[PDB]
Amino acid sequence: GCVLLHTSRKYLKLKNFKEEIRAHRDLDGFLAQASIVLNETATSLDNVLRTMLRRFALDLLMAMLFTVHLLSDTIQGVTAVRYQQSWLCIICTMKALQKRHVCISRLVRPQNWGENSCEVRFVILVLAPPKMKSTKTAMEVARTFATMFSDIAFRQKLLETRTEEEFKEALVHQRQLLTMCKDFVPFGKGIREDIARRFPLYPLDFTDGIIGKNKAVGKYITTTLFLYFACLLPTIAFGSLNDENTDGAIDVQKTIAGQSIGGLLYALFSGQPLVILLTTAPLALYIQVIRVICDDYDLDFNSFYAWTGLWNSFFLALYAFFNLSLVMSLFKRSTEEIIALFISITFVLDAVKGTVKIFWKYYYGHGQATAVLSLLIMLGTLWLGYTLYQFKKSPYLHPCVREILSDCALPIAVLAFSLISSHGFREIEMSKFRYNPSESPFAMAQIQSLSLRAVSGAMGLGFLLSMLFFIEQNLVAALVNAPENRLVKGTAYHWDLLLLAIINTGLSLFGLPWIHAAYPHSPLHVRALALVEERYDTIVNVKETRLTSLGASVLVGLSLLLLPVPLQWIPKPVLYGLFLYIALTSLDGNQLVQRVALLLKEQTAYPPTHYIRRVPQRKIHYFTGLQVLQLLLLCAFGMSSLPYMKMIFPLIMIAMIPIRYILLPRIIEAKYLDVMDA
Amino acid sequence: GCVLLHTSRKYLKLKNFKEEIRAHRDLDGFLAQASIVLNETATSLDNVLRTMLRRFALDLLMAMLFTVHLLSDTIQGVTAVRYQQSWLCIICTMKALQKRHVCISRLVRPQNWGENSCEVRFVILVLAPPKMKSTKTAMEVARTFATMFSDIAFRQKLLETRTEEEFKEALVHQRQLLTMCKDFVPFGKGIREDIARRFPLYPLDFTDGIIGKNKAVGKYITTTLFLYFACLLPTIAFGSLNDENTDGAIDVQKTIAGQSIGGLLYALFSGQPLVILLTTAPLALYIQVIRVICDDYDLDFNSFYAWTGLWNSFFLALYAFFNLSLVMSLFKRSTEEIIALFISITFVLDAVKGTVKIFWKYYYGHGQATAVLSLLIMLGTLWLGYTLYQFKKSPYLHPCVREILSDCALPIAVLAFSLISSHGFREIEMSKFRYNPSESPFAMAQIQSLSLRAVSGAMGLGFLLSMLFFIEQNLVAALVNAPENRLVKGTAYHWDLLLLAIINTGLSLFGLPWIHAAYPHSPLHVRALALVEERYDTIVNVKETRLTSLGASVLVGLSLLLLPVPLQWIPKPVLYGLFLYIALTSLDGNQLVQRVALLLKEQTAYPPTHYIRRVPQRKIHYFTGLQVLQLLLLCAFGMSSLPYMKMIFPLIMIAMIPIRYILLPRIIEAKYLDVMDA
């Protein structure tokens, strides 16, 4: 009979002995168990294969090797294209084997085996079991020896060898050969450069995916809905928290007005408009502490709150003018991900702490149907949102319909379980955020009323806020401007910091909560607008536009007209499910989370990532343990009961820079740490 | 520089024009848009490729083709091994293309291009986009034309052609050439053969995975735990159901005693011991109807219940003696899966109906914390059980530890949420099955008490039970003895039917519920003991043993000593989660469920299954729709409110055999229907 033969030829990059440790490991393993055939008098490929196989330990073994042109897998050197007939590498995958076997056979006289194998002198046989790590497969071990034999000079030295000991020494010798401020001086330069780099590209922001081809109108609509739910609901939670911390001085109306006005201005007038401004729990702590200070002394809350905001904006303006944002470049992947993971944990803790408050208040009566339903709604919202989030990686629908359905994972989950909780369970009371009609009519806060000995206190608090604002604004912007997120417009670090000061000084004067870059929202905003090739997963490009951020801000502002509806129809557990959803989905692409899971994973399932190929496995696990230790340091000072140590948390963020660049190099080699950053 | 070239050679089976429709479809598509180059005077591969590519619509196109030995992908014919230098097929995957392009070029004079391409006359170029169905990829379309060109006689006819019209006609002509009772006579033979086929292998059943190598002791322990929870909890539910249907005549104690005694005897003395005996809801309907009959007339329940059991066993004995189980061979995959899916739906409906009863009784007070918690516990048990079930397909643990953890998916989920419901929510009442001390002390039922005009009624009911027992016992045993489940011991259909009659006549005499083969449990029992290669998914072998079934039966019997504990500690929602778990997990490997999902799936995600390659896609979807229509027929007569039409449900099972073998061939071709069965 006749059979069809499929021949596939693919180029393979030469193994990099300088970077890839696996080449050294494979060579050392071969040298420890050397199987070298010297002066092989066999004149045929079959006899050479028989000799090598019997040296390993017979007819069945050769049957697996074949299907020289009959060999199933081979690697040959090509010179830019001329083949290298001097040597040949043979590769086979045998299930019955338990470990990798490598044999090198040298022929006495060159043999003519084919068109590209007419001068064969060295035959390399590599045998490996099918279930192996992607870095130590049969092909990978072959690439180690193929790279060494691809050098004409090295092959000549092997031919000159006379004994097996000299043959190994040549292999060792070849492996050795293969192995072997002024920036801040111009004040205001950063601000001018950022504007100059973004102003010409300003019209492109509004017409990036509206005119021409590749009209991503569906992406813009879905992203705006995602931002609207991801911003408004936490804003209500933080507005209610400020309502009960300031005794009505800052209510839900002011927290949503500040988000709308601040978000609208930032979207229009900032470079890199993918950064989403939102108030945070640490910012609520500062507002709460100011109320305590204003209660202990005879100070007006609005006057003191305005002044510390003014000093906060004053210091932020100096940082942008002095180009201080350049120091934030020291926060590499080794440090940003620890802070990135910590904030996600805080959102998880907010849902957990909120659920415990429902159990304490309702279940124990400090009735039970509300507590149990709250657990069901919170977990149900997380399940439905995450299931729709993963639906984009399924074949069950048309790609256009599936993309839209998965992009609305959060809006659907919030809407679906709001109806379930408010209409499917009308008979069960649900915990809902407090709402009261407007009380403070957006006053000026009377900054002149506050006297000396108090503006100095605001200056002290303003300096602490400046460090919190400076670090958080640049860290989230760095995540947005990450090299993996292929942005081809610019960064605009210094202009954003100055604009954030301009935004926050207005909010402080009118008693509105401060807002800066939000961690979970902005990377997700970039991720929502990104196109994933899924080749492992890479972002082809991101639809950089102001429409999503500007549209969401307008929608948040319009929520004031119908403000009673979200608070009465959306219960707290739906928000707590949203907190779990954004925290979990923000962990995608986090290398620290990937390496934590790497510990609880079989060896054969290790992906061929960049750091695994370069860094030793033991060093990788040591680095993961040290990062977890640094994470617990953040948790101790960031999620504690005492409010004073939580306020000095930005100092802990600074303290990890000496830890990364001084303490860590003494434990792990500096080159290995660089691979993690790269 | 030097680069490494990887050459992979793999044999490809010749495309089967008789069976695979895709060969005909590809050839017709090529003929509709023929791109044929006649009398190609080019003397080089590059010029021929340029001519073919310009005929398709230039330098960039060729760069993708190469990396003749430089071609990335090629298919050549090999004669048993001598290559065929006459022709050559070139394959390339281009992203910029929207549809498949095939070009055939005939050379005026043979050209010498390489060692195995020294007499090239025909060059075949196939171009396809990367995202295509597995049956119509670039390689698959190449295999269609490579198979035709692999015939020496066909190539000669092409050489004799003079015009393009004659060239196409030769392709059409080649495609046409490629395209072109006594059993029941020995009474008792089946019973003797089954015993003779299983008795010599009886000692192997107890020592299959205990002595020697491949000691699957861990599998036996985990499977026994799975069977114990999967049998005892439904038994309690059906015992409680019989308790409230017979007014205490058949209680939980009798339903568990019958399961233990019947299961223990079946495990020891039956061939194919992987079949699990369990009472079913249809069997509870017969018990309930007998109570109604015994209430309408002045008949003793135990006397009438015993007699209809005696007649049921009498008819089942005749079926085994007359070798009637051979007729059940007409139930192929087209019919078994419809019944298989229906039973899984009934278990889903039992959980849904039970949950509605909790809402009606507790939520509406016919309080609310019990109803809401019941929903949370039922869904939580399903989630935890299914998550652990899918954990076996993860790399996050050692294979031995991961296998044990995933095999205990059901025992852990039941135990975990029993503690959560009974200890984490002690303050909330939960619906639990009724328990009362033993009332009937296992009497003889006094069969002689029942007089004529009533034993005739039992004979009528016994005949209906016999049809229910006959069909269900053979259907579940057929699923256990499925060809995919590679069992190398035997089937034993006739002996099991006789033994089931012997088991059920004892149960009827002592007032115990009838038990026959259980659908969800026995395939899962085989699946639990099976080894999956996961090459898509195939079962290498199954650990056929009696220890799992016998051990579970003993454990069920020992549950009588501590009988109050399961009923008071395990609430109904945990059972309802178990019903959802077994119903969902039993759908794995169901081709009907796979084809239902095939409708809601993009074309490019269609797997290369057996039926997809042979049967036209439109015919596959027509067959799926017809099977769903048959499924709704079962639902109408099997899940209705009226009990009389539910009792004639086995007649509907019989009625689908004429539908499959008479009605369906008039709608879809008989050959296509055979592919589904095969």
Curated annotation (Swiss-Prot), chains A, B:
Q: What is this protein called?
A: Solute carrier family 4 member 11
Query: What would you give as a GO molecular function for this chain, any one?
Result: active borate transmembrane transporter activity
Q: What is the effect of changing G506E?
A: In FECD4; affects protein processing and transport to the cell surface; the mutant protein is retained intracellularly; coexpression with wild-type protein does not rescue the cell surface trafficking of FECD4 mutant
Q: Which organism is it from?
A: Homo sapiens (Human)
Extracellular side residue ranges read: 243-255, 292-304, 426-453, 518-541, 591-594, 640-643
Q: Which domain of life is it from?
A: Eukaryota
User: Which gene carries the instructions for this protein?
Assistant: SLC4A11
Family according to the record: Belongs to the anion exchanger (TC 2.A.31) family.
Q: Which GO terms describe its biological process?
A: bicarbonate transport; borate transport; cellular hypotonic response; cellular response to oxidative stress; fluid transport; intracellular monoatomic cation homeostasis; monoatomic anion transport; monoatomic ion homeostasis
Q: In which tissues is it expressed?
A: Widely expressed. Highly expressed in kidney, testis, salivary gland, thyroid, trachea and corneal endothelium. Not detected in retina and lymphocytes.
Bilayer disposition of the protein: Multi-pass membrane protein
For this protein, the record's Gene3D superfamilies field holds: Helical hairpin bin, Mannitol-specific EII, Chain A
Task: Give the InterPro entries listed for this entry.
Answer: HCO3_transpt-like_TM_dom (IPR011531), HCO3_transpt_euk (IPR003020), PTrfase/Anion_transptr (IPR016152)
- SUPFAM superfamilies on file: Phoshotransferase/anion transport protein
Question: What cellular component GO annotations does this protein have?
Answer: apical plasma membrane; basolateral plasma membrane; plasma membrane; vesicle membrane
Cytoplasmic side stretches? 1-219, 270-274, 329-336, 391-403, 472-496, 567-572, 618-622, 665-678
